[PDB]
Amino acid sequence: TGRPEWIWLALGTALMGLGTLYFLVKGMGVSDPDAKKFYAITTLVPAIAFTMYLSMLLGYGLTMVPFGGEQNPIYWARYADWLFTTPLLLLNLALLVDADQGTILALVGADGIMIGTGLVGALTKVYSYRFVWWAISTAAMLYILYVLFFGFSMRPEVASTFKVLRNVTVVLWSAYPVVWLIGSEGAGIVPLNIETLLFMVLDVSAKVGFGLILLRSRAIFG
Numbered sequence: 001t002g003r004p005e006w007i008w009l010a011l012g013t014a015l016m017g018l019g020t021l022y023f024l025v026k027g028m029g030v031s032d033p034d035a036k037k038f039y040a041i042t043t044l045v046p047a048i049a050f051t052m053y054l055s056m057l058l059g060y061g062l063t064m065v066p067f068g069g070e071q072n073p074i075y076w077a078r079y080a081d082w083l084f085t086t087p088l089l090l091l092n093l094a095l096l097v098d099a100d101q102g103t104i105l106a107l108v109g110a111d112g113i114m115i116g117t118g119l120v121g122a123l124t125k126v127y128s129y130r131f132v133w134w135a136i137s138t139a140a141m142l143y144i145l146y147v148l149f150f151g152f153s154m155r156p157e158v159a160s161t162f163k164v165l166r167n168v169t170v171v172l173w174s175a176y177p178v179v180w181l182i183g184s185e186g187a188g189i190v191p192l193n194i195e196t197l198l199f200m201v202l203d204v205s206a207k208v209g210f211g212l213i214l215l216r217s218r219a220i221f222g
């Protein structure tokens, strides 16, 4: 289409759809209750992202936000996606290490704050305050990363996959605040189409690459 980032939204739609169908097919037959949860979470995540990617691709998940005296294209549909998929991703981690309920509530809650303040920052029309919201959201993110590293005798398989995915998590999730800051939601240093490319590469890796690593490990089986 006529938005140059369409190709990345189309590619992301395709890859999230394909990942969803792959994991769907893959978890066919699975009968281990514990495995079941990881497959459910793991399939649901790019399923949701598939729909929100599609929503962006078709223009529904896009709005215009006036700031800097300009009419700025903001893909709000990403926060609808992340609002659900990032806690689910954190749930995969939390389940893996058998986290306490209170740690799960702290993560999910921190995560909703992260995304909702990100969303608020995304939609805020006073340019400076956009970054106040960025900052609070980043602080929730840093809280989450804190908890993933310092907040948790588990099976060596679980520990191993958990350390890998945790690593994967810290490196990819940390990139999102940077992209937002330098891209069109923030300082407008990086153009929207490049930003969408970046978020697509992060999202696919954070969702599909992450679940391919998780769904590969025997850590998911009781």
Ligand SMILES: CC(C)CCCCCCCCCCCCC(C)CCCCCCCC(C)C
Pocket: none
């Ligand atoms: C009781 C304790 C822990 C601290 C009180 C001492 C006073 C110092 C200020 C707070 C410092 C503690 C956190 C250290 C790490 C940081 C990254 C602090 C960043 C400071 C800047 C803005 C964030 C808000 C703050 C007012 C803490």
Ligand SMILES: CC(C)CCCCCCCCCCCCC(C)CCCCCCCC(C)C
Pocket: 015, 016, 018, 019, 022, 201, 204, 205, 208, 209, 210, 212
């Ligand atoms: C059979 C397997 C392993 C995967 C098929 C599921 C579908 C999803 C798409 C491929 C995902 C797997 C790799 C995860 C990591 C990444 C960094 C993917 C980046 C995607 C974007 C462009 C690169 C080309 C791709 C089409 C894989």
Ligand SMILES: *C/C=C(C)/C=C/C=C(C)/C=C/C1=C(C)CCCC1(C)C
Pocket: 049, 082, 085, 086, 089, 114, 115, 117, 118, 119, 121, 133, 134, 135, 137, 138, 139, 141, 173, 174, 176, 177, 180, 203, 206, 207
């Ligand atoms: C499914 C995709 C994932 C894992 C997306 C993760 C997104 C984040 C970690 C977002 C973080 C942000 C902040 C820390 C700063 C403000 C803006 C955000 C929402 C991009």
